[model samples]
Target: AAPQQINDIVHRTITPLIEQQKIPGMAVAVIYQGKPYYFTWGYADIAKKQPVTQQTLFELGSVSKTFTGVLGGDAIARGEIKLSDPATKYWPELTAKQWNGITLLHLATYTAGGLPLQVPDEVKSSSDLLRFYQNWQPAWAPGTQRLYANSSIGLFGALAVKPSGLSFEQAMQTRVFQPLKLNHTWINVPPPEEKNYAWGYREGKAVHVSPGALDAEAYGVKSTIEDMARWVQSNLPPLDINEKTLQQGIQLAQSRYWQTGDMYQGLGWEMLDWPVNPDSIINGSDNKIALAARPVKAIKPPTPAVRASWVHKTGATGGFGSYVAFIPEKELGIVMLANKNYPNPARVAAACQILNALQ
Candidate 1:
């Protein structure tokens, strides 16, 4: 294992978080060369007066997409799905209006021919999931544009069970959590653990919402730092993947499956190139450069760095926030999770500082 700057930076960044945000309790862990330097601060449940532990669970909103991505890769390894396979293949029940040309890869990349962010109607049971897809239609050509569509990814999970012959929960447990030794991460919480899992918080008030329904497939994963540390270690590139399939995922990212910026969309992962490439030929160029390429521009990148370099994904809703980033040249990867919502910055800013100092 290699030595890392995680410990030094964790203390510097998190100490202020305790005072500044009134964040009751939080847990964090970093994987440096497949080893963990763990940190937990505040309380897991403020009202219970309990301290956060490595096992205490936090709701991982969009961070769950990474898990889904891993599942997609695993299914690929087993020859169950291909990056270019139309999503309609798995769920043949979908009508031509909604399911026709959309592919599984598009769902993974959130570019499913331009599906909306969500279906607009509330979805509860698995039956509703089918109906939702029935109503869905591509706003753009599949794999051509990137939007953060939860339904796109959700459809991936729904389709996964068909070829794998396992329920979504079963597949995740056997393929992902069990191998990684993450015992507590689950799509739905068991009765015994309910009291221990931290509820979602906003501006210090508990938000009342059930962590159920199809969207839970998108955001309902409950996990602790101990489990996620293991996940981060497993994802280190040159990590493991059959070369052919690895090439597929990387190729989707390298070439434009969908364009967030100059970089193409990889399955479940957003691509960004650091030190933004200025040329039109370069993939993963700065966000501004990509948007500027648009004939009629509406929005712009906030900062030069947002375009030039910095590939990141932020997942948050009512109760949780998590982020993961990679610096291509530096060979660095970072993950951060917080137990509160709104203005969550503890991990993101820390990674930024680390990236700057290293450069």
Candidate 2:
């Protein structure tokens, strides 16, 4: 499907969303058959009526984890580390026995056995964070249960890049963003790009997110629709612009690692069978599935990274909401970035509608 066809489908899908959710602004990017299409609605700044632009940077929230997850994948591709390696193999200070059975793979897959959704309150500093990991206890053996938490992937991101001796930001820029030519996507919006960053809305007032435990690695990222469209496309064929390492890294990310209910856990995104049941996606948004611990079984001899699959991840912050979904076999994907934080179900339903209509 071309932009003309997708534009009409997306228009019908998002128009009701804009009115019902009272979203101040939204930017949607779709990639079909290796071609990209973009669309926008409402205002970036409702009070001033700033239209959503190609450069409008919207916060990505937890979708940023996918980037962190890819950093782990890149490390794997570079032979800097492996999923089976212990966490202490890379970081110097994690010399604690509590981390023994918890492998890099466990952290990336949220199977670190009942990690809290947030880094503990006592962890106010890096020194404190290290101590928390030492004191932490697993409720189930590592890899036996999946609990979606910032603690797992946040620590994974920090340690995943340790072998390169690059900060997560630096590694991401060098290994992922730079190679993809995504000059506008960033963990921290640079001062020069400040003007283009969109303002988020809550309670009809402009707002931004407050700092949280391990947030930068877990949820702190902002990007434009244009760059995100390119990002998602890179997950498909011609995985990179001829850069094999990152292309391999992105491909590694989609490999099946575990199964929980109908959802197959990849490095960062969750995979559901193709022609996904919209209710399955809608229900997964419920906190029961999103935040609670559930048993998961490892995919022995993991499934190939690229396959006929529907992959997706949803993210949000105090004011902004984001959703990215794609079918690798179909070479089709969609990204929705909005200023107002609405129910996750709305985003899921709309995205499912768009994909089914276009698929």
Candidate 3:
């Protein structure tokens, strides 16, 4: 197929969503055969008339969780930790019985019983967060239910890196970023990339993320679509990594450990049957999936990561929205990033349409 055809297909899928959502800017990309074909539209800085370019960085929100997942996978692969390891093994404060049943696996997969979607606003420090976890009790036994939460994964990232003697960001950079050789994805934007930061819009004002408890581990990443394309591409074929241990960890990270309805839980990604219906994509990733706890059965032996599958994740904050989905069997994936927090269904549907066209 011609490149113009791909561009037209992308435009057909995206223009209407941008029109309907009135998004100030967007970056969309498709990865095929490990190469990316991407497009950018509108303005990164609307008032200054800056266009959305490949280098323009936008906040990833919970998409950052997937990186944490890969990090945890690295930890587990190297015997630095185990899924069965008690949370208290890394943080002594979590020794309380209420959390004794909880393990790193539960937190990594967002099953730490009924954790709210966001860190409770009142939590201002690590001590405050520990108090929240200490006093709180689970509504469901660990691993029996899934509730998408920033809190659980946040704790997972912080504690997962404890054995490494580095903070979460440091572990990610030295292990994941340096090894994967990603150029632009970051938990903290370095000075060189600061000018590329795209202004996000919400509540009739332009904005971006601010620090909050566990925010960095949960939703505090910013990146260009190109780098994420490589990240997703790396998840497919030949794995695109050289470090034996980190490569092993990436495989483990993508494995499906549990299932709730059609959604199979991986570390940070969700797996669904390939050739999925758009409705299934929306239904599985909708707010209710994370906001409400749903019973999930163990996959027993778990589905080890594969080169190709229909896997995806959606992430957003007040000012930004992100959706990534791919069919590894087909070696094709789509990335959608917007300055405005567009609806989840729209992001899924757009990717669905574009990927279908690619297939």
Candidate 4:
């Protein structure tokens, strides 16, 4: 597609959605055949009339899981952790004997028995987090089913920091962000960068940012379009990270680990075979399938091709919305970030339309 035609399609598709959805602002980045494109619309601070820019930061919500998942893979590649090692290997104080079978692999893949979607409000501190897990029992045997859980990924974050001797935030910076050179990304937005942080909204009201125990590993990242484009590029095959271990980690993170029906799970990414229909990917990430527990069965990879497959993830918080999709073999990716929470299906549709046009 011609550059002008691509811009026209983006404007035609995005303008109405912005108005209809009442999204205050959004930043988009697209990579086609290794070339990068960027578009921004509306305002970062609506009242101030500050226009959205490539550097404006938006909350990534659960999309942050992919980063943590990659970190776990990195740890595995470095021989600092093992997928099969019991969770107790790192946190021996966890008293739930049923958790004996829970491994970092289970945590990363959302198969850690049945950790709940959120940490209980009463469980505020690290000690409380451990006790909650220690007293808990799995709803089913580990690895038997897939139950999406923030607490499970949160546990992975806790486990990730143990051997590295760094705080989760520091661990992420040292192991992932720094290595990836995602300078505009942060688990905790530092004071110096506050000016670039986009304010998030829900139904026209500004929301106070709240941190949960799992934010480190689940839904806390704030990033800019340029940084995300780089992240997506790294996910392309012929991995870009210099270290062999990081390359191995990236591959491991992207590999499918389990599946049920057409739905498949990787570290944090959801996987599907390519030339994928948009609705299939969108509907698969719908809340019902993405959130609910289901029997998990081991499955072999589908027919491989040059680009081989597609992987994507949708994320939302009280206010912000995020979506990321990429075809490694094609070296094509799309990233959408918005200050207001919008429908996941719509996000997928928009991205797919743009991706299809480029192809």
**Candidate lDDT (C-alpha), each:** 0.62, 0.86, 0.85, 0.83
Candidate 4: which stretches are off by over 4 Å?
Answer: 299-306
> Model 1, residue 21: what's the lDDT?
72
Say which prediction, candidate 1 or candidate 2, comes out ahead on lDDT: 2
Q: Residue 183 lDDT in model 4?
A: 93
Q: After aligning candidate 3 to the native by TM-score, how far in Å is the CA of 134 from where it should be?
A: 1.0
Instruction: Please give, for residues 1-359, the per-residue lDDT of candidate 4 as tens digits.
Output: 46787797788888888888889999998887767789999888888889899999999998898898888878888898987788889988885678877888788777887889888878889898888988888888888888888888878877966898888888889888888889999998899998888888987887635877777688989999999998888778856657777777777777777877775678788787788877887776678767888888754552222256788888888989999998886788899999998988889888888888776
Give the poorly placed runs of model 3, Cα more than 4 Å off: none
Q: Which is the better candidate, 1 or 3, if ranked by lDDT? A: 3
254-305: candidate 1 lDDT, tens digit per residue: 2224444355455555555665332332222232332232211112221122
Residue pairs with backbone atoms closer than 3 Å in model 4 (clashes): 307-329
lDDT of 3 by residue, 1-359 (tens): 65777888898889999999999999998986657998999988887889999999999988888888989989988889998898888898676787877889889998877877788889998889889888887788788878888989999999999999998888999998888878798888988887899999997688989889988889998989888888887777568456877888877877989988777889888888777777887766667655678898988788887645688989998899999888888888888989999888888888888888877
Model 4 shows how many backbone clashes? 1
| Clash count in backbone of candidate 3 | 3
The candidate 4 region of ten consecutive residues with least summed lDDT is 298-307
The whole-model C-alpha lDDT of candidate 1 against the native structure comes to: 0.62
Clashes of 2: 0
* Per-model TM values vs. the true structure: 0.79, 0.95, 0.97, 0.95
Candidate 3, after superposition: displacement of residue 86 in Å? 0.8
Model 3 TM-score (2 dp): 0.97
For model 2, which pairs clash? none
